[PDB]
Amino acid sequence: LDPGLQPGQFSADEAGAQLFAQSYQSSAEQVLFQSVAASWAHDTNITAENARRQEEAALLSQEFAEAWGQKAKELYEPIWQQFTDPQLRRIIGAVRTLGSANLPLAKRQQYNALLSQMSRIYSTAKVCLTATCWSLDPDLTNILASSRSYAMLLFAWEGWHNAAGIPLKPLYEDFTALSNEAYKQDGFTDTGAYWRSWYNSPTFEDDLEHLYQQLEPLYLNLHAFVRRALHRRYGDRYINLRGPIPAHLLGDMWAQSWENIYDMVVPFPDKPNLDVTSTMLQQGWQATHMFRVAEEFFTSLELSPMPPEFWEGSMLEKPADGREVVCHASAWDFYNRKDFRIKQCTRVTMDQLSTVHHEMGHIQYYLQYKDLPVSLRRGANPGFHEAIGDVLALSVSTPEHLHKIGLLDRVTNDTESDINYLLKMALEKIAFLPFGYLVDQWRWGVFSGRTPPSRYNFDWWYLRTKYQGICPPVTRNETHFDAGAKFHVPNVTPYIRYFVSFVLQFQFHEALCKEAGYEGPLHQCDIYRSTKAGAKLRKVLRAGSSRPWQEVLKDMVGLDALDAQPLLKYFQLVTQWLQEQNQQNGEVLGWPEYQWHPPLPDNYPEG
Ligand SMILES: O=C(N[C@@H](Cc1ccccc1)P(=O)(O)C[C@H](Cc1cc(-c2ccccc2)no1)C(=O)N[C@@H](Cc1ccc(O)cc1)C(=O)O)OCc1ccccc1
Ligand SMILES: *[C@@H]1O[C@H](CO[C@@H]2O[C@@H](C)[C@@H](O)[C@@H](O)[C@@H]2O)[C@@H](O[C@@H]2O[C@H](CO)[C@@H](O[C@@H]3O[C@H](CO)[C@@H](O)[C@H](O)[C@@H]3O)[C@H](O)[C@H]2NC(C)=O)[C@H](O)[C@H]1NC(C)=O
Ligand SMILES: *[C@@H]1O[C@H](CO)[C@@H](O[C@@H]2O[C@H](CO)[C@@H](O)[C@H](O)[C@H]2NC(C)=O)[C@H](O)[C@H]1NC(C)=O
Ligand SMILES: *[C@@H]1O[C@H](CO[C@@H]2O[C@@H](C)[C@@H](O)[C@@H](O)[C@@H]2O)[C@@H](O)[C@H](O)[C@H]1NC(C)=O
Ligand SMILES: [Cl-]
Ligand SMILES: [Zn+2]
């Protein structure tokens, strides 16, 4: 590690602790910058040489983390817990936390290579027919979204899970052992405990569970209604009205979002067609337009536009030249207060439009807190970061806002239209809740040793059935590693943030709508052009992680805790409607025939 990047001396009291933190953050900017740059170079251009460079960049970060970490522990370890300044307690608490830098050299390199190999496998995995091969993004995504052929959907589902999952398992086991080894030397019982500590709530898991209890009836009812619709199209052989839904029929590879089957479930088809995708295509929208339209919403709020460095540096389309990339969307902070980028293999679609806003939400956060000390450049909690863009997308997707941007010709205000809109939103937002909740439950069990390699898939599918009410359409066994077929698992990034942001985003929406002086039903609010809503959001963004999230929430929303009530109020009309539909249809809520799996199609597997 470069002499300039190494730590000096500071006194072993609270006041020396203050000066230590000041120089730490000064050197960290350059280390973070070269780390992110090396990751950028790789994720936008997956080569062995670029993986190597990224790995050597991670080693440097680990040396850095070691030097300042050992120093922070040398001076402050026994005393920093009783320190009077709680913000200093945070930063020093984070510097005494070495992570992977706790590993000896050989194991650091082992760790770094594993992250690189898992990433490459997920992002370059393909499903071959017999010479031509389909990628996840766009090919398999498109199939799952628009094919209504059972065997074609199954081919894509099975192919993807087999191709991504199977080779990942050995590497995932080794990663887990080394991640746990690293973080246990930091005093955590396992890596899952570390991840959970970011929410600093001794009661985190109980709070989440109480939240899910309130939300579960909404899911059960959406599930039953949707399953009925699928039965009408796939028949009695492939759909069990008292069983779980096959996992490949819900419009999405992970059955995590159901918006793509909206056309099958829409209650009042005579009302404006709220799936704007075809209108976008008919009008000739491109990635560029999508990002510009999203930017303009942000500026209508008197938030920052994207800087020139964003437009010149970002990757907004999947490259056409022989180049493999990580296609999964991400927002990037280079930690030089100048470069900020999005990397997204953008598709011309309504859900991709929401994704664009979601990604730009991350960037906007980066722009607003760029002048904070480096350690305070995070969300109030990770869920805050995830909720920013979705909140704007809640406004954008209202029929009225879509009309304003030329994506919907007619404007209607009636109970039929509302039911249509709220159902579409439920398929996006309510359908996700079980999945957003279950992913880290699985992964927390893995980290704790409750779920050993011998039960990876067994436990995955237990949770998938328990929460989502779905079943794999083909038989799985422990050779399969179906969790590794989801991006966030091999890319070693946490998931509970998304369950938190799905609750949080309706809390934010309510507050910004009230702040904008909007008096109507919550699901018809559009905060577009509300500078008052903008100023209120800006305060949250400019705060970064400088204050406990409970206080930031309180200032914004009026409550210091997560709360499902604004989500419930938002969906009240369709919740009551779906209940009534199901009772009139004499549906069974849930999947009592838990053991049920669909048969194979007659000509499986040949297409
Ligand atoms: O860029 C990311 N994170 C990206 C993932 C990533 C993490 C680490 C390394 C590399 C990449 P994403 O979550 O923007 C990338 C995207 C977001 C998304 C999807 C969608 C969407 C909407 C409708 C239909 C389908 C998808 N909308 O937004 C993501 O991973 N989403 C999750 C969960 C999700 C789903 C729906 C949704 O509305 C929001 C979130 C998923 O795809 O499974 O991190 C920024 C950041 C910085 C500091 C602190 C916290 C977060
Ligand atoms: C779509 O329509 C709804 C419903 O509109 C109401 O009911 C209809 C059947 C008709 O009788 C309408 O004339 C009637 O307004 C609209 O929701 C309503 O918005 C109005 C105006 O913003 C609200 O009135 C306000 O109510 C507050 C108290 O909460 C007062 O302080 C204000 O002075 C003002 O009177 C009304 O509460 C609200 N009604 C309901 C049931 O939610 C909605 O605005 C409209 N949406 C769009 C996009 O046009
Ligand atoms: C993708 O990464 C590779 C490195 O793996 C880049 O190839 C280098 O490009 C420079 C300048 O063109 C050459 O001087 C080097 O000799 C190349 N290195 C190797 C190992 O071939 C390549 O430029 C990147 N592609 C894109 C589009 O950015
Ligand atoms: C796990 O399963 C592997 C493949 O699955 C099997 O073949 C497919 C095409 C389906 O027909 C399915 O019913 C079968 O389970 C097997 O090749 C492998 O041997 C199994 N692993 C173990 C340890 O038994
Ligand atoms: Cl998280
Ligand atoms: Zn995100």
CSV table of C-alpha atoms in Angstrom, one decimal, residues 96-311:
chain,number,residue,atom,x,y,z
A,96,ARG,CA,-12.8,-1.3,13.4
A,97,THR,CA,-14.9,-3.6,11.1
A,98,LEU,CA,-12.3,-5.1,8.6
A,99,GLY,CA,-14.6,-7.6,6.8
A,100,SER,CA,-12.6,-9.6,4.2
A,101,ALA,CA,-9.5,-7.7,5.2
A,102,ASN,CA,-9.5,-10.0,8.3
A,103,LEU,CA,-8.5,-12.9,6.1
A,104,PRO,CA,-4.8,-13.7,5.5
A,105,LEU,CA,-3.5,-12.9,2.0
A,106,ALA,CA,-4.1,-16.4,0.4
A,107,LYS,CA,-7.7,-16.3,1.6
A,108,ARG,CA,-8.3,-12.7,0.5
A,109,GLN,CA,-7.2,-13.8,-3.0
A,110,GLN,CA,-9.4,-16.9,-2.8
A,111,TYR,CA,-12.4,-14.6,-1.7
A,112,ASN,CA,-11.7,-12.0,-4.5
A,113,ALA,CA,-11.5,-14.7,-7.2
A,114,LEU,CA,-14.7,-16.4,-5.9
A,115,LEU,CA,-16.7,-13.1,-6.2
A,116,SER,CA,-15.3,-12.6,-9.7
A,117,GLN,CA,-16.0,-16.2,-10.8
A,118,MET,CA,-19.6,-16.2,-9.4
A,119,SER,CA,-20.3,-12.9,-11.1
A,120,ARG,CA,-19.0,-14.1,-14.5
A,121,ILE,CA,-21.0,-17.3,-14.3
A,122,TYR,CA,-24.3,-15.5,-13.6
A,123,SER,CA,-23.8,-12.8,-16.2
A,124,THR,CA,-22.4,-15.1,-19.0
A,125,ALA,CA,-24.7,-18.1,-18.5
A,126,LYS,CA,-26.7,-19.0,-21.6
A,127,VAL,CA,-29.5,-21.4,-22.6
A,128,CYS,CA,-28.6,-23.2,-25.9
A,129,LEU,CA,-31.3,-24.9,-28.1
A,130,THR,CA,-28.8,-26.4,-31.7
A,131,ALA,CA,-26.0,-23.8,-32.1
A,132,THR,CA,-27.7,-20.5,-31.1
A,133,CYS,CA,-27.8,-19.5,-27.4
A,134,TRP,CA,-30.2,-17.2,-25.4
A,135,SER,CA,-29.0,-14.7,-22.8
A,136,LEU,CA,-30.9,-13.8,-19.6
A,137,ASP,CA,-31.2,-10.2,-20.7
A,138,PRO,CA,-32.9,-9.7,-23.2
A,139,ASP,CA,-33.8,-13.2,-24.6
A,140,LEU,CA,-35.1,-15.2,-21.6
A,141,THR,CA,-36.7,-12.1,-20.0
A,142,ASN,CA,-38.7,-11.6,-23.2
A,143,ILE,CA,-39.8,-15.2,-23.3
A,144,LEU,CA,-41.0,-15.2,-19.7
A,145,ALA,CA,-42.8,-11.9,-20.2
A,146,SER,CA,-44.6,-12.6,-23.5
A,147,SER,CA,-44.7,-16.4,-24.2
A,148,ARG,CA,-48.0,-18.0,-23.2
A,149,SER,CA,-46.8,-21.5,-24.2
A,150,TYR,CA,-46.4,-23.7,-21.2
A,151,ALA,CA,-43.5,-25.8,-22.7
A,152,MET,CA,-41.6,-22.7,-24.0
A,153,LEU,CA,-41.9,-21.0,-20.7
A,154,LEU,CA,-40.7,-24.2,-19.0
A,155,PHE,CA,-37.7,-24.6,-21.4
A,156,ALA,CA,-36.6,-21.0,-20.5
A,157,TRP,CA,-37.2,-21.5,-16.7
A,158,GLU,CA,-35.5,-24.9,-16.4
A,159,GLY,CA,-32.7,-23.9,-18.8
A,160,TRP,CA,-31.9,-20.7,-16.9
A,161,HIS,CA,-32.0,-22.3,-13.4
A,162,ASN,CA,-29.9,-25.2,-14.6
A,163,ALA,CA,-27.3,-23.1,-16.4
A,164,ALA,CA,-26.8,-20.4,-13.8
A,165,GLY,CA,-27.5,-22.5,-10.6
A,166,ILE,CA,-25.6,-25.8,-11.0
A,167,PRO,CA,-22.0,-24.5,-11.5
A,168,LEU,CA,-22.5,-21.8,-8.9
A,169,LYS,CA,-23.1,-24.1,-5.9
A,170,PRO,CA,-19.5,-25.2,-5.2
A,171,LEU,CA,-18.3,-21.6,-5.3
A,172,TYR,CA,-21.1,-20.3,-3.1
A,173,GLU,CA,-20.3,-22.8,-0.4
A,174,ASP,CA,-16.6,-21.6,-0.3
A,175,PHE,CA,-17.6,-17.9,-0.4
A,176,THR,CA,-20.0,-18.5,2.6
A,177,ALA,CA,-17.3,-20.2,4.6
A,178,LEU,CA,-14.8,-17.3,3.9
A,179,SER,CA,-17.4,-14.5,4.4
A,180,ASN,CA,-18.3,-16.0,7.8
A,181,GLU,CA,-14.6,-16.5,8.8
A,182,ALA,CA,-13.9,-12.8,7.9
A,183,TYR,CA,-16.8,-11.2,9.8
A,184,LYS,CA,-16.6,-13.5,12.9
A,185,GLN,CA,-13.2,-11.9,13.6
A,186,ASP,CA,-15.1,-8.6,13.7
A,187,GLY,CA,-17.3,-10.0,16.5
A,188,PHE,CA,-20.5,-10.9,14.5
A,189,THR,CA,-21.9,-14.4,14.9
A,190,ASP,CA,-22.0,-14.6,11.1
A,191,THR,CA,-22.2,-12.5,7.9
A,192,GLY,CA,-26.0,-12.4,8.1
A,193,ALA,CA,-25.8,-10.7,11.5
A,194,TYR,CA,-23.5,-8.1,10.1
A,195,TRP,CA,-25.8,-7.3,7.2
A,196,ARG,CA,-28.8,-7.0,9.6
A,197,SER,CA,-26.8,-4.6,11.9
A,198,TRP,CA,-27.0,-1.9,9.2
A,199,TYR,CA,-30.6,-1.3,10.3
A,200,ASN,CA,-29.6,-0.8,14.0
A,201,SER,CA,-32.8,-2.2,15.4
A,202,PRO,CA,-32.4,-4.8,18.1
A,203,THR,CA,-35.9,-6.0,17.1
A,204,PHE,CA,-35.3,-5.9,13.3
A,205,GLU,CA,-36.6,-9.4,12.5
A,206,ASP,CA,-39.7,-9.2,14.7
A,207,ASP,CA,-40.6,-5.8,13.1
A,208,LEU,CA,-40.4,-7.4,9.7
A,209,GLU,CA,-42.5,-10.3,10.7
A,210,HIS,CA,-45.2,-8.1,12.1
A,211,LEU,CA,-45.1,-6.1,8.9
A,212,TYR,CA,-45.5,-9.3,6.8
A,213,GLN,CA,-48.5,-10.4,8.9
A,214,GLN,CA,-50.4,-7.3,7.9
A,215,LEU,CA,-49.5,-7.7,4.2
A,216,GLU,CA,-50.1,-11.4,3.8
A,217,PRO,CA,-53.9,-11.3,3.4
A,218,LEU,CA,-53.4,-8.9,0.4
A,219,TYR,CA,-51.0,-11.4,-1.2
A,220,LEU,CA,-53.2,-14.4,-0.5
A,221,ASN,CA,-56.1,-12.7,-2.3
A,222,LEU,CA,-54.1,-11.5,-5.3
A,223,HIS,CA,-52.6,-15.1,-5.5
A,224,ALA,CA,-56.1,-16.8,-5.6
A,225,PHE,CA,-57.5,-14.3,-8.2
A,226,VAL,CA,-54.4,-14.7,-10.4
A,227,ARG,CA,-54.4,-18.5,-10.1
A,228,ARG,CA,-58.0,-18.5,-11.2
A,229,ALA,CA,-57.1,-16.4,-14.3
A,230,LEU,CA,-54.2,-18.9,-15.1
A,231,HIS,CA,-56.6,-21.8,-14.7
A,232,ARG,CA,-58.8,-20.3,-17.3
A,233,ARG,CA,-55.9,-20.2,-19.8
A,234,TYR,CA,-53.8,-23.2,-19.0
A,235,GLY,CA,-56.5,-25.6,-17.8
A,236,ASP,CA,-57.1,-28.1,-15.0
A,237,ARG,CA,-53.9,-30.1,-15.9
A,238,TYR,CA,-51.3,-27.4,-15.4
A,239,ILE,CA,-53.1,-25.3,-12.7
A,240,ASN,CA,-54.3,-26.6,-9.3
A,241,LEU,CA,-56.9,-24.2,-7.8
A,242,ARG,CA,-56.0,-25.5,-4.3
A,243,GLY,CA,-52.2,-25.8,-4.9
A,244,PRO,CA,-49.2,-23.6,-5.6
A,245,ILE,CA,-48.8,-21.9,-9.0
A,246,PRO,CA,-46.1,-23.3,-11.2
A,247,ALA,CA,-43.1,-20.8,-10.9
A,248,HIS,CA,-42.7,-20.2,-14.6
A,249,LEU,CA,-46.2,-18.8,-15.5
A,250,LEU,CA,-46.1,-15.4,-13.7
A,251,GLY,CA,-44.4,-13.2,-16.3
A,252,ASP,CA,-41.0,-13.1,-14.7
A,253,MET,CA,-38.2,-15.6,-14.3
A,254,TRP,CA,-38.5,-15.4,-10.5
A,255,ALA,CA,-42.2,-15.0,-10.3
A,256,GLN,CA,-41.3,-11.9,-8.3
A,257,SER,CA,-43.2,-9.4,-10.3
A,258,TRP,CA,-46.5,-10.2,-12.1
A,259,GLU,CA,-47.2,-7.0,-14.2
A,260,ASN,CA,-46.6,-9.0,-17.4
A,261,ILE,CA,-49.7,-11.1,-17.0
A,262,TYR,CA,-51.9,-8.0,-16.4
A,263,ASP,CA,-53.5,-8.5,-19.8
A,264,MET,CA,-54.9,-11.9,-18.5
A,265,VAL,CA,-56.3,-10.5,-15.3
A,266,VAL,CA,-57.5,-7.0,-16.2
A,267,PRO,CA,-61.1,-6.7,-14.9
A,268,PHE,CA,-62.4,-3.9,-17.2
A,269,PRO,CA,-60.9,-4.1,-20.7
A,270,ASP,CA,-63.0,-1.3,-22.1
A,271,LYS,CA,-61.1,1.3,-20.0
A,272,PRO,CA,-57.8,2.9,-21.1
A,273,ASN,CA,-55.2,0.2,-21.7
A,274,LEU,CA,-52.8,0.8,-18.9
A,275,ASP,CA,-49.9,-1.3,-20.3
A,276,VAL,CA,-48.2,1.5,-22.1
A,277,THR,CA,-45.4,-0.8,-23.5
A,278,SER,CA,-46.9,-1.0,-27.0
A,279,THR,CA,-47.6,2.7,-27.2
A,280,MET,CA,-43.9,3.3,-26.3
A,281,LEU,CA,-42.9,0.9,-29.1
A,282,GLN,CA,-45.4,2.4,-31.5
A,283,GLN,CA,-44.0,5.9,-30.7
A,284,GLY,CA,-40.5,4.7,-31.2
A,285,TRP,CA,-39.1,5.3,-27.7
A,286,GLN,CA,-35.4,4.5,-27.0
A,287,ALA,CA,-33.3,4.1,-23.9
A,288,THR,CA,-32.2,7.8,-24.3
A,289,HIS,CA,-35.7,9.1,-24.2
A,290,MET,CA,-36.5,7.0,-21.1
A,291,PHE,CA,-33.6,8.4,-19.2
A,292,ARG,CA,-34.4,12.0,-20.3
A,293,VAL,CA,-38.0,11.7,-19.3
A,294,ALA,CA,-37.0,10.4,-15.9
A,295,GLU,CA,-34.4,13.2,-15.5
A,296,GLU,CA,-37.1,15.8,-16.3
A,297,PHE,CA,-39.4,14.5,-13.4
A,298,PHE,CA,-36.4,14.9,-11.1
A,299,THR,CA,-35.8,18.5,-12.3
A,300,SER,CA,-39.6,19.3,-12.1
A,301,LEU,CA,-39.0,18.8,-8.3
A,302,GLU,CA,-36.0,21.1,-8.3
A,303,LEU,CA,-33.7,18.2,-7.8
A,304,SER,CA,-30.4,17.9,-9.8
A,305,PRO,CA,-30.2,16.9,-13.4
A,306,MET,CA,-27.7,14.3,-14.5
A,307,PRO,CA,-24.3,15.9,-15.0
A,308,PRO,CA,-22.4,15.7,-18.3
A,309,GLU,CA,-20.1,12.9,-16.9
A,310,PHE,CA,-23.2,10.8,-16.4
A,311,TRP,CA,-24.3,11.1,-20.1
